[PDB]
From a paper:
Here, we describe the structural characterization of an apex-targeting antibody lineage and autologous clade A viral Env from a donor in the Protocol C cohort. We previously characterized the V2-apex [name] bnAb lineage from an elite neutralizer in the International AIDS Vaccine Initiative (IAVI) Protocol C (PC) cohort (Landais et al., 2016, Landais et al., 2017). In this study, we combined negative stain and cryoelectron microscopy (cryo-EM) single-particle approaches with X-ray crystallographic studies of early and late autologous Env-antibody complexes to decipher molecular details of the co-evolution of [name] Env and the immune system response over the course of several years of chronic infection. Comparison of Ab-Env complexes at early and late time points reveals that, within the antibody lineage, the CDRH3 loop rigidifies, the bnAb angle of approach steepens, and surface charges are mutated to accommodate glycan changes.
Additionally, we solved the 2.7 Å resolution structure of a variant of the LMCA, LMCA (CDRL3SAR), where CDRL3 is mutated from the wild-type 91YGS93 to 91SAR93. These mutations were earlier shown to be critical for acquisition of autologous neutralization by the 13C antibody (Landais et al., 2017). The progressive rigidification of the CDRH3 is further illustrated by the crystal structure of the LMCA-CDRL3SAR. Here, the entire CDRH3 lacks secondary structure, indicating an even more plastic structure than the early Fab. Because of the steric barrier comprised of apex glycans, it is unlikely that the LMCA binds with CDRH3 in the collapsed conformation that is observed in the crystal structure. Rather, it is likely that there is induced fit where CDRH3 adopts a more extended conformation upon binding that enables the acidic residues of CDRH3 to interact with the positively charged apex.
Residue numbers in the entry:
A (entry chain B): 1 to 52, 52A, 52B, 52C, 53 to 82, 82A, 82B, 82C, ...
B (entry chain A): 1 to 27, 27A, 28 to 94, 96 to 212
Write the structure that this text describes.
C-alpha cells in the first residue's frame, strides 16, 4: 500500500551527527512536497523542515530551531527522503515522522477507482526515535516505596537511574492490576531516567497479601523482582 | 512565519456532546492551506480536515471544519469514546507551522486527590542519594499544585512531577512528584512535607514525615 518507512534513528552523542532515511511506496513520490516533523517526549508537534518536488524547483525550508544545522535531501530514483542532522542537541531528542503534508486538491487522481471518484489522503510514517545524550546503558535501581505505618493504603516501587527507555513494571507477575498507576518516566539532570509505579490496596489486605513489583529493562537485559512491605 | 494559537488549551466534555475548537492565526491564512490533525497517544498524527472545510477520505461525518482567514473552527457534532485525543491546527501558507494543540478529555465531577508521601529507603540512603515521593491519586481536573517543604523551607528546582493518562473507569488523574537531594542534605534536616493545592480541596493538604 501507500506507506512511508523511517529508519536511521538511534543514540547520538550531543556533538554527533545522524542521517535519517524515509522510504516511500505506493504513490508517485517525485511529485509530492515532503516534510520532516518531530515531536519531543510529552510535547506537541514541531515542524522540522520541508523540501519541494523537482518540478517546483526543489526549494528547501527549515524551522528556526533547526536552520543552520539540519539539511534535507531527496533521491527520486530511489523514492527516498533524507534528513542530515549535524551539531545535535539534547533538545533535538524526539520522534521524527516523515510526512507528505496536505498536497494539491487533485493529487490523488485515479487512487482506488473501484471505490472512489474523488480521493484525498496524506501519508505519515510510524516515526523514528532519536535520542541525544552523553549517558550509557545502566541497569535500573528499584527502591520500595513502603506503606505508611500511620494509616486504604498505598505502596509502590521507584525505578531510578536507568538508561535508556523503556522499562516495564508489573505487580505480582500481572496478577494485581486494579488500582495500579505506572507513571511516565522522567529524565533527570544527570541524563538518567526515573519513574515510579504505585498501587493502592485495602489496609487489611496489607496483612494477608504479598506485593512484589517486577521491573524489566530490555537494553540492560535486567529483571528485578522486589517485595514491598511496611517498614 | 504565521503563529497559530488554539483555544481552549483543554476541553472537558462527555460522550455525545458538541465540541468546538478554535484556531487563531497571527495573519490571514488562505482557506486552502489550513488543516486539522488528530493525534492519539503512541500514534502518528491523523489528518482529519484539509483545506479548512474539506474532509479527508475515511473521516467520519461528525468532524466539520469552518473558518475564514484569521479564525477557524473544528466542530465535533457528537463526541465518541475514541474522539478524546489531541487536536492540532496546521497552516501551509507562508511557512509550515503547527498549533499548540487542544486536549479533549472526559468530563466528570470534581474529585479531591488522595495524598501519600514516601520517604527514601535505606538502600537508597546507603547508595548516597535521597528521593522523597509524593503521590496524588485519583483527582479531577488534571490541574494540581505540588509544593515541597523541608523544615518549612519552600523548595524549587529539585523536584520533578509526572501525570498519568485519564483513567478509563474513573476518568481521574494521578500525579507523582519526586524530590531529589544528597545524603548530606537529607541528614541535615528532619521534617519533610508535601503540600497539595487542588480544586477539590478547601485548604491545601499537607503530608509530612520525620526521619524515624
Amino acid at each position: 500500500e501507500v506507506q512511508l518507512v523511517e529508519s536511521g534513528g538511534g543514540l547520538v552523542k550531543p556533538g554527533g551527527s545522524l542521517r535519517l532515511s524515509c522510504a516511500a511506496s505506493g504513490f508517485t513520490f517525485s511529485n509530492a512536497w515532503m516534510s520532516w516533523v518531530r515531536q519531543a517526549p510529552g510535547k506537541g508537534l514541531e515542524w522540522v523542515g520541508r523540501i519541494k518536488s523537482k518540478t517546483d524547483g526543489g526549494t528547501t525550508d527549515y524551522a528556526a530551531p533547526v536552520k543552520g544545522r539540519f539539511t534535507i535531501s531527496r533521491d527520486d530514483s530511489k523514492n527516498t527522503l533524507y534528513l542530515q542532522m549535524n551539531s545535535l542537541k539534547t533538545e533535538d531528542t524526539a520522534v521524527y515522522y516523515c510526512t507528505t503534508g496536505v498536497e494539491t486538491y487533485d493529487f490523488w487522481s485515479g487512487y482506488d477507482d473501484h471505490y472512489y471518484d474523488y480521493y484525498f489522503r496524506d501519508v505519515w510514517g510510524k516515526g523514528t526515535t532519536v535520542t541525544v545524550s552523553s549517558a550509557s546503558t545502566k541497569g535500573p535501581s528499584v527502591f520500595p516505596l513502603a506503606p505508611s505505618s500511620k494509616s486504604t493504603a498505598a505502596l509502590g516501587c521507584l525505578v531510578k537511574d536507568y538508561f535508556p527507555e523503556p522499562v516495564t513494571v508489573s505487580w505480582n507477575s500481572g496478577a494485581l492490576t486494579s488500582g495500579v498507576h505506572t507513571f511516565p518516566a522522567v529524565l533527570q539532570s544527570s541524563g538518567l531516567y526515573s519513574l515510579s509505579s504505585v498501587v493502592t490496596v485495602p489496609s487489611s489486605s496489607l496483612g494477608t497479601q504479598t506485593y512484589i513489583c517486577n521491573v524489566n529493562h530490555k537494553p540492560s537485559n535486567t529483571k528485578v523482582d522486589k517485595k514491598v512491605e511496611p517498614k | 512565519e504565521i503563529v497559530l494559537t488554539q483555544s481552549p488549551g483543554t476541553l472537558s466534555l462527555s460522550p455525545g456532546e458538541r465540541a468546538t475548537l478554535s484556531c487563531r492565526a497571527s495573519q490571514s491564512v488562505s482557506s486552502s492551506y489550513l488543516a486539522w490533525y488528530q493525534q492519539k497517544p503512541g500514534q502518528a498524527p491523523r489528518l482529519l480536515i484539509y483545506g479548512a472545510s474539506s474532509r479527508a477520505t475515511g473521516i467520519p461525518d461528525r468532524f466539520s471544519g469552518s473558518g475564514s482567514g484569521t479564525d477557524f473552527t473544528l466542530t465535533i457534532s457528537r463526541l465518541e469514546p475514541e474522539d478524546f485525543a489531541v487536536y492540532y491546527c496546521q497552516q501551509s501558507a507562508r511557512s509550515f507551522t503547527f498549533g499548540p494543540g487542544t486536549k479533549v478529555d472526559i468530563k466528570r465531577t470534581v474529585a479531591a486527590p488522595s495524598v501519600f508521601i514516601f520517604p527514601p529507603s535505606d538502600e537508597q540512603l546507603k547508595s548516597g542519594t535521597a528521593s522523597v515521593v509524593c503521590l496524588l491519586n485519583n483527582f479531577y481536573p488534571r490541574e494540581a499544585k505540588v509544593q515541597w517543604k523541608v523544615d518549612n523551607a519552600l523548595q524549587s528546582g529539585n523536584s520533578q512531577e509526572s501525570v498519568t493518562e485519564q483513567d478509563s473507569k474513573d476518568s481521574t488523574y494521578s500525579l507523582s512528584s519526586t524530590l531529589t537531594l544528597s545524603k548530606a542534605d537529607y541528614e541535615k534536616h528532619k521534617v519533610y512535607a508535601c503540600e497539595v493545592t487542588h480544586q477539590g480541596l478547601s485548604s491545601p493538604v499537607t503530608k509530612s514525615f520525620n526521619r524515624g
